[PDB]
Amino acid sequence: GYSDRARSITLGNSTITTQECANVVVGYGVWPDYLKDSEATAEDQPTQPDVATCRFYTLDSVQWQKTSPGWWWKLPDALSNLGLFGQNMQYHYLGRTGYTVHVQCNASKFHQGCLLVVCVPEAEMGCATLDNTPSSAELLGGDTAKEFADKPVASGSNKLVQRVVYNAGMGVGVGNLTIFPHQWINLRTNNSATIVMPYTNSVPMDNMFRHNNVTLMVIPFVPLDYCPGSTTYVPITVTIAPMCAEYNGLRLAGH
Amino acid sequence: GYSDRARSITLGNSTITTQECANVVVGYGVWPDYLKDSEATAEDQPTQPDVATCRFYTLDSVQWQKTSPGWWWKLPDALSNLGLFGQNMQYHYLGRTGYTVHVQCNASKFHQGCLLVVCVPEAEMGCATLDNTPSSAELLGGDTAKEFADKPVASGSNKLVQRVVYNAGMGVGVGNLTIFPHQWINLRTNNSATIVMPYTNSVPMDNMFRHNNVTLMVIPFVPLDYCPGSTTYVPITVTIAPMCAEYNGLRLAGH
Amino acid sequence: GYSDRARSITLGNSTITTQECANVVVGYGVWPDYLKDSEATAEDQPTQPDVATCRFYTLDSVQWQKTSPGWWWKLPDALSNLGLFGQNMQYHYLGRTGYTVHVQCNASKFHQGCLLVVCVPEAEMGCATLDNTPSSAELLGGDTAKEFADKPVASGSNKLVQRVVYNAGMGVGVGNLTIFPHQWINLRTNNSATIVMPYTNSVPMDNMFRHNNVTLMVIPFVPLDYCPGSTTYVPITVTIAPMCAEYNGLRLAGH
Amino acid sequence: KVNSMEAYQIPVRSNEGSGTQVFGFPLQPGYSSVFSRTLLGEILNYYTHWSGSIKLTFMFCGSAMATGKFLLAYSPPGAGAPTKRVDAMLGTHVIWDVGLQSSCVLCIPWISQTHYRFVASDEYTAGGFITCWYQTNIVVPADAQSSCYIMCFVSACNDFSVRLLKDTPFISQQNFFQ
Amino acid sequence: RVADTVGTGPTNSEAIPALTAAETGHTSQVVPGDTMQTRHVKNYHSRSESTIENFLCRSACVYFTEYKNSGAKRYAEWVLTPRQAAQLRRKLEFFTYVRFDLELTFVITSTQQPSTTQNQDAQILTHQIMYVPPGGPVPDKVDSYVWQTSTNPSVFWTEGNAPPRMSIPFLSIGNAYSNFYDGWSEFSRNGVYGINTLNNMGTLYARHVNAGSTGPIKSTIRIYFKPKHVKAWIPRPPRLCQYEKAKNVNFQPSGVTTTRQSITTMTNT
Amino acid sequence: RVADTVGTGPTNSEAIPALTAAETGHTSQVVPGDTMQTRHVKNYHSRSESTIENFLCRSACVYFTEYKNSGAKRYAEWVLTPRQAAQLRRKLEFFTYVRFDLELTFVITSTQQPSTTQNQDAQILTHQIMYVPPGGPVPDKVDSYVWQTSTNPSVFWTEGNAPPRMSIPFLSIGNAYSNFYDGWSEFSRNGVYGINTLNNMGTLYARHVNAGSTGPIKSTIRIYFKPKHVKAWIPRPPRLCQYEKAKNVNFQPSGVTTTRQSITTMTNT
Amino acid sequence: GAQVSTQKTGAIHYTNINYYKDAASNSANRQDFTQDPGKFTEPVKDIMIKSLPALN
Amino acid sequence: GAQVSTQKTGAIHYTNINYYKDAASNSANRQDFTQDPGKFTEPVKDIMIKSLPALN
């Protein structure tokens, strides 16, 4: 209907409308749907959270500086605090999810900059120490944005993650991250990215409080830039919504 | 399809796309096509240059000042250097051509100005001396823009062309030049002019290295104007493409 | 029609008639035609030079002495000066050609002599120095006839071609050159050779200003001989015509 | 500019004289040090042959009021790369007019004398030169930054095929990973 | 079989198949015809030697160890992983999930070791390569009951014949081998990182059956893997920076490209 | 199957199938019947063992190199060209363009080298012949990562068995291999002359897998080429003067024929 | 039964009979030609048609 | 399928079955008999008929 600048994604109670943007990028060509019986490995009865764990959970906003390295938020561990998603993953052994990762950032028409919004499934990060693994408090968020750096993280005995924008903390060239579903938030025109992740794993259902199946990375390829004066604080706000959640094996609260 | 801001003219190898502009102005109502046998005066066999002498030959750019007189480029003598058009006119006695004269000039939305893009067939210029004819090195370009002046060219024994914007160097009021196919490049909105010239002459085919059948004139009617600062160098770039070229009488290289 | 002494080859503007000669020798059994789509490796649009690059370009005449070694003219590099063939090969990356190599030599009926007119595709010449390659100014003509010699070219550090009539400058016996399409110009009767070369290469189209696909060699097997007096200057004139020319990839002027 | 995010951005600025060169690199993927670590080039280093067209999408990431036109030209090998826009025109070019749809695809067609080409350097076959020139200088109003950026993207066409597999040179090891 | 070009000609309508935002995460398909005009060209090129399987199905050496026939280490041991050779590893790490069968070929070559032993004469050493499934028994001394191969597969190969070959089917707890695992094995998120039990096909031990010659002989078992019946899902960037560990993705930062001169240079340094 | 003769008889009409100018570049076909009279003779002779393929399809040795198993050159290297042996080369150079598949057979034979080393006993050397496609990696030290044969083909051959054989298909950038190239690779017409990239199937390296005996052993890899599925176009003169270089047609002038006595002598000198 | 299929030709027939009990011991499926780039390329919800601009 | 063809006799039958995936690994085409000397011999435009002289 008319212009494609408009979009409106209603999931449950919360709606995200955007005045101006572009197309929604759908997964690898699959939209998250429930797991059928010919893939169901669980023998127990699953719950149906429906609309009450499919609302757009608005994670922490982070401020984009004129020159800023980039950010990443793990996916089952950014929602391990918010709402009933954070409950269910803890009371249930197995969980299965899809996402609507919607990154929204506005800017004036005198500002320029360009974010790459990718969603890397299975981002296994390296480490500054070449024989130690990361910690679980540097590697993961807490719904907070972890940010990289533009200089190598110095080696020692530290278990801090290796964080360099250009290697993406994985040891792959940053410019090749575009294979994975993504979109760009070029501030010239297009002010949001919508990436619909379908459930991707080697097993049909997996624990979410020990395994992080998706990692969102928002990397500015063209630094934010403008003239003197104006506004100097253009945040990037992430709204993520679980989609087609399904759990099994009703244990008890844990870690 | 959708907005008319878009246009795309593909002739051979080079394409000119423009994000924003208006309609293409087609000749006097005729689009250049090959000369049929009921008009063919030549008794010899013509060549077909096809795509290799139908690409958009990008002539010299000229810089539009805040106040600038105007410019003109003769048509068979702006292409007498570039590519195979410059070859063919010299090896062949007779030639027949149409054109796609596309004048492109961009500006910001804080700039104003307005060019008149006309194509005067048979522009016979006067002379500063009222009893001498022009020279062939002042009158013609070399693919370079010749520019007029806003004050009368002083008389003497000089053979320099009479150049005054308001008389167009022909002794006709400048405001009446709009009869001829044209377009305006109002910088407010509309950033190119496309004028499709069909072959116009009294004879069916004529030598091109002695006769100039069309003369493009780009005259700013509203001077370029803006506020202090910003950018101060808005060029005007001309891309011309021969269309339906046909030659005859394969002589040898000459003048 | 009547006698076979007559022949008349009209290509474009120039015609070559001959009062007396013999049959035209057609290639290997193929007459040059345009390359079809099932052989077209180029993805670009080719030009059609037609009649304006299919005229008989008359190369340099050379004088046959009483005892003379022989001559050779490379084929894409004897026409790299004359007409529009010399232009097109330089503005276009790829080119494809056939030829009508017509060698004409007249003599009186009191003269005797016999030329072998062969066209060796891919004549890769040796060198006087047994570890150096030829130069590009001794090996090639300039539309001029290069002539061999009857004594071995002395070795040193020179890059001059090995030129001996009896080895043909290739290291093959001269008497076996007859496999290739040819004809003889026996001065007793038969005063021209017409050899129609079709395009022969391993690839469908190739650059012509770096590769010479054919080499015409005119070798006198029976020296010119006569009595004292009479005329003493019987030239051999070569008229070559491109046939079914086709180019692609409209670059710019080069070497 | 090969150890930061400065590598990927192509600096564009308003320069008063038009005919200045924006960038220029040969097309010779899997050898050229511009495409040696791209996605297309890295798949290409496992093959000895390649054939097909290649798409170079240029995306203007300037201000939203900045304008400019660029003459993106690909000149086949036949000479040693243009040094003027007036020479670059003669090739296969595409004039990109900016203003909405912030990308324009210059598609490089297959021009080769053979049905394949080497990925590794050779001089029997070459891939020509890809250059960009200003067609009409970057006009930027007041309060908008006068230095913009362009991004270059490399992709393969649907008329693309690779043949004869070999193994990469851009990976190495000394002793086994303990 | 690839696609074909078709005749086009001039274009002056509002189509502009070139101009289109690539900001939408959509990689547009543009043919020659769109930026110029190209006649009908038939292509017979074949995009076969580029299939996922054919790419991965090439035997690559993953490892090799040495074992004296008379001394200390009379047996070698290897936990099966393709993560010991850079070459094979980088190909597998071009996909997130892969599923395949393996063909294990062992190229055992013996070399005599310098010694002052008198009258050294070999009587054709016979080698035993034994596969021990994950959670099997572990031999120590080379005479242990473990080597009885009660249920454990083994190839017995007499030297000077075609190298031993055996197949292994797809053995994974899950439904694909994970080449990248983000997660721990422990619920408290400590310990090993991405050392998940899905790509751990037990151990492979090898030893000399006989006592060979009187003198010492050292043999070198070279292991070859060849992926048959491959299916690969989720493509991902090839590794850039060099590998550091055989179970981690640890790396030292390095260049983004190979450097050259200016932005307009036409020749690589 | 060749043609047959048929009865003729006297001829007194204006036919003269003999007299005809050969100045027209036309090689006339004259039968026995034209110069005499010959009755009907049936010929069952067969012109098969003269076909283009059968002519060229014979295995010819193109080269052989040597490599010590313990010392310096532990590997040999060869840029594939048929231009190293006079015999095969002259057959190929009877055609301007040829197209074919290759069968590479390697006949590796080992010879013990004299030494004062004590108790030299071999344990069946295994050889590796590896094909490196053009623009591959190049091994240096014989232990380099290159020899992992990650994608590069290799034949592993234990000594004392049928010699290794492998096929190569037609690999050429063009549509035929050029046996004679007139042109340069450089647009300025300098450098190499006729060293075109169409007959350059990379390199082939070979080495000892094992450490063989305690003493030195030198092995000799002999390479055999056998053209299958041959198609040959444009015939041309066979080479007269002897070859001088493996990439040029350089020669020293020599005789046009072998000499004899007079023009009317009936016996060769 | 004997599965007969054309050899991979550029521009014929080979018998092949599986001889082993398992189907994990059959020769590789080198021939298995399929292409479907509507996945990673153009993953968008509503396909952009090449005749107008993607955005309004 | 099995291709049966006569052995090259002077004046019978052999089964041959291609066993390899590629068609560049099949045995040579030793039998492939054709002759057509209207090429290099007599390449002239208008064929000279043997009953009169070529020239007038």
Ligand SMILES: O=C(O)c1ccc(NS(=O)(=O)c2ccc(N3C(=O)c4ccccc4C3=O)cc2)cc1
């Ligand atoms: O290879 C295995 O299957 C095999 C090898 C060792 C093994 N471990 S054991 O149960 O400790 C064992 C250890 C030694 C012997 N053993 C001897 O001590 C002996 C002395 C003299 C002759 C024969 C043998 C002989 O077998 C038998 C069994 C089991 C099986």
Ligand SMILES: O=C(O)c1ccc(NS(=O)(=O)c2ccc(N3C(=O)c4ccccc4C3=O)cc2)cc1
């Ligand atoms: O053949 C190849 O595939 C192979 C040979 C050498 C090679 N190059 S390397 O990456 O420099 C390398 C160099 C040496 C070793 N290596 C050792 O240093 C060693 C010591 C003791 C036992 C085994 C080994 C062993 O493999 C492993 C790899 C790669 C592969």
